[PDB]
Structure 1
Amino acid sequence: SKVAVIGATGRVGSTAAARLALLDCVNEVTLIARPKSVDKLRGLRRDILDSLAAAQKDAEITIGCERDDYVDADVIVMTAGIPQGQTRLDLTKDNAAIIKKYLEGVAEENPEAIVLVVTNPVDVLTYVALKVSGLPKNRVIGLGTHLDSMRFKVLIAKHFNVHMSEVHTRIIGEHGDTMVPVISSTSVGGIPVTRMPGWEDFDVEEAVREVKEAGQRIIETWGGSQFGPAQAITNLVRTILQDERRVLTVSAYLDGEIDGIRDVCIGVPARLGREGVLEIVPIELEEDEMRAFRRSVKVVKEATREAMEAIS
């Protein structure tokens, strides 16, 4: 198995690459960056190889900077993105240009490649990546609200003082201010969270507000999320390369599987396997949850239209 990380010189890309190289299912991690930055990857390669020696894990760490260095990869993780007088539309256009530059026409050379988009806006860029690459709709996904769900899982776990793995929550919709917390599918130790003593003392709105602002708050303090998305990326890649066929919230192309919504890449629960999105599970969203989703799909569709019009 070959996993190429586009933008490995970056905060998320470097950490994702290091953790990805520890997975037993990953046999090669290719570090990809711009030509002038290849020298920076040489230092990262040696550093990761040292970490693998300490963990007694085997993995080949290669470096590249062209299409032929990663197009043949089983999974391509897109972590390249411009840093933050710039509106959200300008960032989307610049980052979209990077998506096209790297992923355009990948299907012609590798029709069986899976692309995991991390660059923000992940929902919009996940759609851009799918169209420029020409790959099937199930072989392109984005981190989406996967990380948002983990952040919401932290708050729930700490409130009940339970192990983090005891909480299972789910946030769908955009990776932004229109995300939709699915409380109906949130549980603590298999128990519906609504039936948990303490839920009444849990300020959902406040918690949901922290998750929405967590991305910006981390950038303003630490400089940007790093280990969170690195580990989330590792988990998604492991689920794919090992064909675990498990449902995970990711940004995927909708084709009428939920409320007949179509032609949009947004965060939804999808069963992931070696062949990508094996299916988009229909959820029993409540009235308010379904409404909030619709508003989220409208925002993503609008932003996606503006992004595609600019890539033209």
Structure 2
Amino acid sequence: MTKIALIGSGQIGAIVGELCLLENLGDLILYDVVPGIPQGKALDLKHFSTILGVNRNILGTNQIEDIKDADIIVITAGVQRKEGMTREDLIGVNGKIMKSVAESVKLHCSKAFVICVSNPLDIMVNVFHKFSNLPHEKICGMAGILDTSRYCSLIADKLKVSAEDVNAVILGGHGDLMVPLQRYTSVNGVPLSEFVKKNMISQNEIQEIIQKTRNMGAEIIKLAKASAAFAPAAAITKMIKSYLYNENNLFTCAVYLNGHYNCSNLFVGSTAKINNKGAHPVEFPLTKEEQDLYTESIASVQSNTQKAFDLIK
């Protein structure tokens, strides 16, 4: 009975649709602006479903009114960045597309939980909120779970351990001003600081890893000649799952801050729980230096969000 609507049928959207079919999360509605594309991917996904014994319904469509009564909405519509571009270079073109999608969600399914993915991520979440007229808890963007997977993946490689239980918090905008927290990084419970004391990893090796985590999005674009698709989709699916199954998991994602971390009235990457009712920020006690870094990231997201609103007229 659950309806999952994918607004954008590119790489990310299709793979999210694939993962949702693998876990039987819901019926799919594959939407795109380009005719034929969603209908063809929906065909391929039905045949996939038949081979793997999944039976959920899949509809490919160019009529956005088919999004009605979606429980979940995943928004990937928009242009992706090429080599040499920043995520912020898409601000003009994607802001306008995000506004249009917002307007469509507004009239067709105002009760949905909305996961935004178009870049630059944090900025586009703010745009969607502005024109959608949905409650702020019902809107978020995925980024932190991707950046955290990259940072944890690198930490795990340097320590010669499974990535499976390396956890971390990364705060801030999905961009160069991310703030990975060493204090909030653990290996099956054991703080990262214990591995520095044991000389298994050095403060310089960690700064290196933080730099690679920042540039990772660009590095994949350079190498693969396309932006990351699989990890983003997995991250999104994890947020969907936490919402549908009321799991109340604690992630980093772009969420409405409201007095948390000395910030108010902005969507930005932060620690949050996701459940039945949506995405809810949680404030943890930062050091001065940590909060300073986080505020600096918040400031960019503030500026660029204003820039985005301005360029929409």
Shorter chain as normaliser: what TM range? over 0.9
Q: What's the secondary structure of 1:52's corresponding residue?
A: helix
**Count of equivalent residues:** 306
Asked if the contact 2:106/2:132 (under 8 Å) is kept, the reply is yes
Shift of 1:116: 0.6
Question: Which amino acid in structure 1 is aligned with residue 237 of structure 2?
Answer: T
Q: Which residue of 2 aligns with 1:242?
A: 245
CA distance in 1, matches of 2:237, 2:153: 18
Q: Deviations over 1:115-161 (max 9, x none)?
A: 11101111000010111101001001001222111100100111122
Q: Which residue of 2 aligns with 1:164?
A: 163
Runs of 4+ in structure 1 over 6 Å off: none
Structure 1 residues 226, 130: CA separation in 2 closer, same or farther (over 3 Å shift)? same
Alignment of 1:1-312 (within 5 A): 1-8=2-9, 10-24=10-24, 26-34=25-33, 37-84=34-81, 91-104=90-103, 106-196=105-195, 197=198, 198-200=200-202, 203-222=205-224, 223-259=226-262, 261-277=263-279, 279-312=280-313
Asked if the contact 1:67/1:102 (under 8 Å) is kept, the reply is no
CA distance in 1, matches of 2:305, 2:87: 12
Shift of 1:112: 1.6
Asked if the contact 2:67/2:108 (under 8 Å) is kept, the reply is no
Q: What's the secondary structure of 2:118's corresponding residue?
A: coil
CA distance in 2, matches of 1:145, 1:103: 22
Gap runs ≥5 in structure 2: none
CA distance in 1, matches of 2:133, 2:6: 20
Shift of 1:5: 0.8
Asked if the contact 1:123/1:267 (under 8 Å) is kept, the reply is yes
Shift of 1:108: 4.5
Asked if the contact 2:31/2:64 (under 8 Å) is kept, the reply is no
Asked if the contact 1:172/1:293 (under 8 Å) is kept, the reply is yes
Q: Deviations over 1:167-216 (max 9, x none)?
A: 01111101000000111110001111101231337611110111111101
Question: Which amino acid in structure 2 is aligned with residue 253 of structure 1?
Answer: Y
Structure 1 residues 182, 74: CA separation in 2 closer, same or farther (over 3 Å shift)? same
Asked if the contact 1:127/1:304 (under 8 Å) is kept, the reply is yes
Q: Deviations over 1:238-268 (max 9, x none)?
A: 1111111111110011111223x11111100
CA distance in 2, matches of 1:255, 1:30: 33
Identity fraction in percent? 29
Q: Cα RMSD over matched residues? A: 1.8
Asked if the contact 2:64/2:104 (under 8 Å) is kept, the reply is no
Shift of 1:110: 2.8
Asked if the contact 1:183/1:193 (under 8 Å) is kept, the reply is yes
Gap runs ≥5 in structure 1: none
TM-score of the two chains, using structure 1 as the length reference = 0.93
Q: What's the secondary structure of 2:22's corresponding residue?
A: coil
CA distance in 2, matches of 1:135, 1:32: 20
Asked if the contact 1:145/1:179 (under 8 Å) is kept, the reply is no
Shift of 1:224: 1.2
Question: Which amino acid in structure 2 is aligned with residue 19 of structure 1?
Answer: L
